[PDB]
Amino acid sequence: KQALLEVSNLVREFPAGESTIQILKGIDLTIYEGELVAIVGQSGSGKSTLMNILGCLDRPTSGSYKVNGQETGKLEPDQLAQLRREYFGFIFQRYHLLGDLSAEGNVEVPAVYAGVTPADRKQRATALLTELGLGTKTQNRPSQLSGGQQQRVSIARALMNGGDVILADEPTGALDSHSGVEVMRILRELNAAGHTIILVTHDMQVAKNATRIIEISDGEIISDRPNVPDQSLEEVKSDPDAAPAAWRSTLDRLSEAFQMALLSMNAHRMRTFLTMLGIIIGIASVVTVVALGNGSQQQILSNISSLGTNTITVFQGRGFGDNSKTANFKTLVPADADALMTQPYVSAVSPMVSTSKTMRYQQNEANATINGVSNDYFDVKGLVFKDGQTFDQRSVRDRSQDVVIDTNTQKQFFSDGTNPIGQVVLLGSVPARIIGIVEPQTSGMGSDDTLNVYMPYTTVMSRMLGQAHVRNIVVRINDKYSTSAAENAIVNLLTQRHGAQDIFTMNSDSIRQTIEKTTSTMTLLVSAIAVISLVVGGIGVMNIMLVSVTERTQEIGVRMAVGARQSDILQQFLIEAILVCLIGGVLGVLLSLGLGQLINKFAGGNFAVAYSTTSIVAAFVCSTLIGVVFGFLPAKNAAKLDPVAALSRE
Amino acid sequence: KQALLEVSNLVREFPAGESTIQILKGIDLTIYEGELVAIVGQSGSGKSTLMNILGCLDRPTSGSYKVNGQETGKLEPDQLAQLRREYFGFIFQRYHLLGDLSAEGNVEVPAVYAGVTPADRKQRATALLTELGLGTKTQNRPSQLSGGQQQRVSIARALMNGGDVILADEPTGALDSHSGVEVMRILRELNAAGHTIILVTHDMQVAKNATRIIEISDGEIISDRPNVPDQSLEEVKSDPDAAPAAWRSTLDRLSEAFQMALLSMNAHRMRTFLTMLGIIIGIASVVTVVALGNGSQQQILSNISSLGTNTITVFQGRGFGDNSKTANFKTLVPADADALMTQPYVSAVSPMVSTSKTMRYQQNEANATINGVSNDYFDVKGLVFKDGQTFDQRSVRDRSQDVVIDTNTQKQFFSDGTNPIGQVVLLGSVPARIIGIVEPQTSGMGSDDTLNVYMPYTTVMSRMLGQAHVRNIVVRINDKYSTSAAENAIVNLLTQRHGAQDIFTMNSDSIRQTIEKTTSTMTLLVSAIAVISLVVGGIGVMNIMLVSVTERTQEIGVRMAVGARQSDILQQFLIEAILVCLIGGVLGVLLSLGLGQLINKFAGGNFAVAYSTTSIVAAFVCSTLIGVVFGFLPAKNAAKLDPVAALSRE
Ligand SMILES: Nc1ncnc2c1ncn2[C@@H]1O[C@H](COP(=O)(O)OP(=O)(O)S)[C@@H](O)[C@H]1O
Ligand SMILES: Nc1ncnc2c1ncn2[C@@H]1O[C@H](COP(=O)(O)OP(=O)(O)S)[C@@H](O)[C@H]1O
């Protein structure tokens, strides 16, 4: 049969000066289930090292330590953690509780790592705290408890996963006489109930509370004797404490890891706020710059949209003056448009003049732009008729006073729902009857807001301007033919048709393309400058997480001792970083949205802010990725701590 | 006569639940110089509270406490610190040493806070450490010392500033039996030497080391009896330890505050690196963006300086399509420049043609752009002659083969130091004699880097091109007399000479002004976005400083008890932040300079990086201001800590 704790020729060496020093020197030691063992020696004796090895927090480097038959010498971290969850509970001189949790929570932690039903572990935690006289202090934080009360909490914690072997490191060293007596009473009562208890001390008067006293000095055991305490006659057991013992639970520990990181945020609200603030400012500047560049691009493009697709505009305008010295040189005339119409690369053509008059209806007045155009103009610019129809070529010839109106003029003058078609409006001093309504090119509520009116160019030229010439001529190029080659043909045709190079062009597609390219490139560079800010925010996240790993070093050690896997610690800290970056990426998005409405109020007619939902999604994802990347390094550093050095980190 | 410590009616209340609780209930107590006093009681007794008041770390809050006649009831923090420096030394259960310093440094700290000569305090530190058996461990850090060794370090520390009244709070509570014997031996020997010692404990067997035992319970003193230790027979005194003891010095404490901040940076090197890194990225991005916008503006403007000042260039339309359409439609001819010459607003005028030929010298060849210009061209464009002169008007008439060169061609062909003037070079197939060298308009190279040659336009048109027309004509407007009106007048005149409006103009000053304003505006917007990054860096600095205040809370408390003023603490932390941000600004500047040299390797001849020295200085100042500001709140929070709560922070 196996003895519960079986040590054989245990040698623990440490390197010291291109050589070694033995701290444990060939220790043989058998401890049976139910013994009350005290191991006593002074500083330097090796009692600590021995207990660390006994608690599966360290490995021999020479010898054998079998826990219920299981050799620990060659076990890997999660296997030793398995043994700690299975057979050991720990009590520390300084009563290492987790300041952020309640007594109940600290008691639960080992059951969290062992994968114990949360309802059942709640029951067990409050039951053990009540059994040890802390039934009314269940919800107190460690900062709300006295030393003895905290040590009683950690006794209940040690009992959570069974309490098979309670390893107690000088429990009565920090706290006073009375509460030391109480702690020792509890331990002896647990031993009476069958709990194996190993007490490590330097005060023989503490060791005398045990039934077996092993004395250690300079790495070797020098005494091993039974003992009967004197105070067993006073402390009669009038309060009979007898309380001995691929995809499933990973989810439970992930839920708890989220909860734990969340509580660490609630504990340090200023720190959390500042770190999130850095991420909020970063994400907000990136989403803002991107939406500003996109919306401004769309706005500038709509301001071009008064031109068509495959549209070549033929301008010639310049300085003003007399009829004989300026008008005689205005060679662009509608006969030129008639000539262009017959070219194999021209699918549509329209002269274009314009004037601005006061438009009247029953009582309304409003200034409006009256465009003198061809019946084909709507075909050139791609305008869509809402209700009516265009001009007849005859009505252009006959100087008709028919008129086409856009959506904006309908809103201005026919807000009642009165059908504009057939209604006579008055343009300055010229009456005109509406024969059609056009849906504009504009994309946006307040991106255009102008009143466009369309009459035959012959009528506007004759009745309103008194001129024989055209402001410009728009041409839509056939067959998707090379608009540039058609452009050159137009320049040669009109130039040969005129007496000289009296014209210049505007290629709508070329200008649009240049605007898209230039605005896109500038958007990319500037939003990269914003991403620099976001990078600095991420660096801040990493630095804070690393520092909180240092802060929580002892918490990490305690969690390991109670049963945490390196995985579990990694998940805990990494989830903290991720949650911090997400909560703040969302707030950066919302801040950017509010700032977007601010700009959309106070901006001009070129600056506009438009938020693509995939830039919002990209913001959320890149915030989470900053959490995963920048937070990872600290979370791994926490997961890889030596629980011995962590427990004694001070 | 006055007793050293004179206590009367100490009542210490703390609020607890819409009421208060008395922790000291009217304590009277007289302690004379040289007494060895133990104050003993269990948790709740008030012994610590009493000892804190005795040490000038708290105020009676009701009653009187006189230290050598000085009432503490109404004293302000720095006055209580004065009393601590004057009369008190402190020893703590956990032997609160400063992990970053050596034993010697920890011993020095109280002398730093007092007005003590650094050399003399070094001597005292090593002397006291040698007296207490730490002569060979003088340089060890606290992590390199045992509990007893650290406790002897803090004994020497308490003795540094005199050791008048040594308050020891459970000194033998953390450490083992043997080293407790040694600590108590040392304390008794100091008492024999005359030191007043007040020992506070809960273990009567420790209290029995004193000669006077005052027992306290539930806030009141219940026993006060003399005592003779049992070990007075053991200690025959064979080793007689008898060692009893704003413009001027503010600068010395500033030196020490700088040194302490520096050592704290060395202690946490990764933290320092990351915190500094944020500022480095911020300052580098801002200085980089500013230098990029400024230099690019200078480059793009240099490409315009070739258009001269107040110069209106008369360009002409394509005019091509055929060789016969070139002959037909190239209406801009040098006679038009002759006509422009006579106008009242034209001070100088030049036709301009250009072609590219291979420029040859003795054996050297390089392709060069030959500009056919008027003798006035240099006045219009504002070019300055380095050595020679321009053409004669006669030589323009006579189709002269004179040539003027720029500095780039001088470098290409006359690198020897050979004077180009009088030398005959060959341009394609036309020889030409150099009559002058011209210094260009440009500052940065960018795209030019071009070989410019100037010959009479009549000669280039006649001999090299075989054409009757001019590419464009430049005019310099006198007095700046309505250059915009001159543009229109030129168009009207040239249009009147031709058969149409077949010419257009370009106002050099308008273009320059537009470029200057637009690029300047882009510089401000983008560099503001970089400053966003710098802001996030500062926020990170603040968060880190708050965290290091929390981390060092006990260090702050120990410093206060040892004798630090709130001033001293604030200076310490403020200097830390300032120093980190200052260095991060310097490194941000150096990174920015390197990045500028990197950018200058890019293929964009429009992007250029120019560093103003006032943006470097601005970087230094704004980095230091981030240090002071963010930067400040943590340092004040450190200075305003309650030294009692700070010392008991865990
Ligand atoms: N890294 C390391 N390096 C060198 N020596 C070590 C190390 N770790 C432990 N030891 C030794 O084990 C003992 C630890 O606890 P003990 O209870 O025996 O005395 P303490 O004062 O440390 S509580 C101590 O006496 C040390 O001499
Ligand atoms: N903020 C505060 N609030 C309420 N009560 C306080 C407070 N501070 C001290 N006290 C009391 O004074 C005593 C402190 O030291 P003592 O040596 O007498 O016992 P300890 O267990 O704290 S070492 C302690 O027993 C407490 O009951």
Residue numbers in the entry:
A (entry chain A), B (entry chain B): 3 to 247, 260 to 664
Q: What do the paper's sentences say?
A:
The envelope of Gram-negative pathogens, such as Acinetobacter baumannii and Pseudomonas aeruginosa, contains unique tripartite machineries that export noxious compounds from the cell. MacA-MacB-TolC contains similar components as the relatively well-characterized tripartite RND transporters AcrA-AcrB-TolC in E. coli and MexA-MexB-OprM in P. aeruginosa. However, the ABC protein MacB is unrelated to AcrB and MexB, which form large trimeric complexes in the plasma membrane, raising questions about the structure and domain organization of MacB in the tripartite efflux pump. Here, we present the crystal structure of MacB, and show that, by analogy to RND transporters, the MacB homodimer contains two large periplasmic domains (PLDs) that enable the interactions with the other components in this tripartite efflux pump.
